[PDB]
């Protein structure tokens, strides 16, 4: 019984950054190599566990959350670091431990005239906590007069699209991205080959 | 209540001396915003400084990284930016900004010269 | 390696009642991700554009943005003598961050 891994990397549609996509993975059995050899990954960072030696382990459950970013913010999906992703939607904790898996898709993601599918949130009064995912869409409040559902001066829709185009520089372009988060608590459900 | 940055605190400086500039703002929440300084030095172009995001992340442009720190009061709805080690370069008007789509809104700028 | 943005010309003479453009190139394709300010002598910059070609609030009709990739022009369709001034481009959401041109100064042609 394999880990549905083909489900999550090789998904037709990926999900916006601030509405990213968790899949949770268990009773099954993961080979983790065939990622790591792959060639095909620009990012594949572990952190702690080491990206060998991983299908000698256990776990109770694995979660892949899943996105679309920029170039640019792919250091962003790393414990400790902010910015606008890190900051506003998709939040790692210090204390990870897992894997970070990124690879340009500037042939599936891009469009000629911008491909406005994939939204990042740009407004948000404070910070993420760990795993958050805040699907709000309320005018964000700039200023101390309420915005009663109308954009303008002070009252910002609070998600901006990215707009790839293929002609984007490397670090405009879009990445997709995994997170490979290992849990234990119970009998471990996911666990490596033999 | 009127939409405004107002700016103080520029003055003349020794290289290797501090400063610190304010901007208190009026018609929007400084806490809520992303706000930067942005300088012009004599006869140049704008340079943008450091941000503040409403959350609380800072980041600063290389040329100032480790000697000037951007900060806020809340309750007093203003904006700062600490200078230390400062250099001759360092001699420009010095504008802070709100950035909602684009700086819209800036204010009237305060000179700092660093001479010895 | 960082985006660079180019503004040209680095200075414009026009009359009043011209079609003016000046033009903003920015190394990489940036979408649209730019801003076009105006700044006069003593004076703090004013936003114009964002988003390359979103007319900002109160700014006047005869000032219009194009271009997405790596060109981006600012028209002015009949220059005013309020018009004078200098122009700066500005890289949204650039890495380093707020990446301005080098301005272009529109003088009064003789």
């Known amino acids: 019984n394999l880990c549905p891994f083909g489900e999550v990397f090789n998904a037709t549609r990926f999900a916006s950054v601030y509405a990213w996509n968790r899949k949770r993975i268990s009773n099954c059995v993961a080979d983790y190599s065939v990622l790591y050899n792959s060639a095909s990954f620009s990012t594949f960072k572990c952190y702690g566990v080491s990206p060998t030696k991983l299908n000698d382990l256990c776990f109770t459950n694995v979660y892949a959350d899943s996105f679309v970013i920029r170039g640019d913010e792919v250091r962003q999906i790393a414990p400790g670091q902010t910015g606008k992703i890190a900051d506003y939607n998709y939040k790692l904790p210090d204390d990870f431990t897992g894997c970070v898996i990124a690879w340009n898709s500037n042939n599936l993601d891009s469009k000629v005239g911008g491909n406005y599918n994939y939204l990042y949130r740009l407004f948000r009064k404070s910070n993420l906590k760990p795993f958050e995912r805040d699907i709000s869409t309320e005018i964000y409040q700039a200023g101390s007069t309420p915005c009663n559902g109308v954009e303008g001066f002070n009252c910002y829709f609070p998600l901006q699209s990215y707009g790839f185009q293929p002609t984007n520089g490397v670090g405009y372009q879009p990445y997709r991205v995994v997170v490979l988060s290992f849990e234990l608590l119970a009998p471990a459900t996911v666990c490596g080959p033999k | 209540d009127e939409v405004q940055l107002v700016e103080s605190g520029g003055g003349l400086v020794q290289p290797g001396g501090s400063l610190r500039l304010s901007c208190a703002a009026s018609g929007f929440i400084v806490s809520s915003n992303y706000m930067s300084w942005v300088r012009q030095a004599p006869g140049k172009g704008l340079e943008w400084v450091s941000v503040?995001?409403?959350?609380?992340?800072?980041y600063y442009a290389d040329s100032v990284k480790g000697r000037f720190t951007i900060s806020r009061h809340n309750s007093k709805n203003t904006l700062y930016l600490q200078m230390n080690s400062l250099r001759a370069e360092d001699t420009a008007v010095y504008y802070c900004?709100?950035?909602?789509?684009?700086?819209?809104?800036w204010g009237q700028g305060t000179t700092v010269t660093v001479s010895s | 390696d960082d985006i660079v943005m180019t503004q040209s010309p680095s200075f414009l003479s026009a009359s009043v009642g011209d079609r003016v453009t000046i033009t903003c190139r920015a190394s990489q394709g940036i979408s649209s991700y730019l801003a076009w300010y105006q700044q006069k002598p003593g004076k703090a910059p004013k936003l114009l554009i964002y988003?390359?070609?979103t007319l900002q609030s109160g700014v006047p009709s005869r000032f219009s943005g194009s271009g997405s990739g790596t060109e981006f022009t600012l028209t002015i369709s009949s220059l005013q003598p309020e018009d004078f001034a200098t122009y700066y481009c500005?890289?949204?959401?650039?890495?380093?961050?707020?990446?301005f041109g080098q301005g272009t100064k529109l003088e009064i042609k003789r």
């Open positions: 988003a390359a070609s």
């Open positions: 503040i995001y409403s959350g609380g992340s800072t």
């Open positions: 900004a709100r950035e909602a789509y684009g700086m819209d809104v």
């Open positions: 500005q890289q949204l959401n650039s890495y380093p961050p707020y990446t």
